[PDB]
Paper text:
[name], via its second and third [name] domain, is known to bind synaptic ligands such as Ca2+ channels and [name]. Drosophila [name] [name]-II and -III share 49.2% sequence identity and adopt the canonical fold of [name] domains. We observed the classical poly-proline helix that allows for mainly hydrophobic protein-peptide interaction in all three structures. In summary, we find that the [name]-II and -III interaction surface of [name] serves as a multi-functional platform for differential protein interaction with either other AZ components or the transport adaptor and therefore, motor-cargo linkage.
Numbering used by the authors:
A (entry chain A): 1433 to 1507
B (entry chain B): 1685 to 1699
The structure:
């Protein structure tokens, strides 16, 4: 809860992609091509902070940064 | 217009 000392918390996590994702083929979002990251099964995404209220993580992959759908990654 | 997740894949991962 809110009371007590801060706990250890990793601001960066590595997450394995379990499914291919090309926003142009699969995203329902009007701004997908601008803001979402493309990736392939087996690639690992570095994820920064928490998922947003829509379910996306801010991720990095091979020099490119963008939002990634949490439901395509291994939790 | 809000953002939402794509539909979740239903087939087992090929990984």
């Amino acid at each position: 809860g809110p009371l007590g000392s801060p706990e250890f918390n990793r601001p960066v996590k590595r997450m394995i992609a379990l499914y291919d994702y090309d926003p142009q083929e699969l995203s329902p979002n009007v701004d997908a091509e601008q803001v979402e990251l493309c990736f392939k099964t087996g690639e690992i995404i570095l994820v920064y902070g928490d998922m947003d209220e829509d379910g996306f993580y801010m991720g990095e992959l091979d020099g490119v940064r963008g939002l990634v759908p949490s439901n395509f990654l291994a939790d | 217009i809000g953002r939402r997740l794509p539909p979740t894949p239903s087939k087992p991962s090929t990984l």
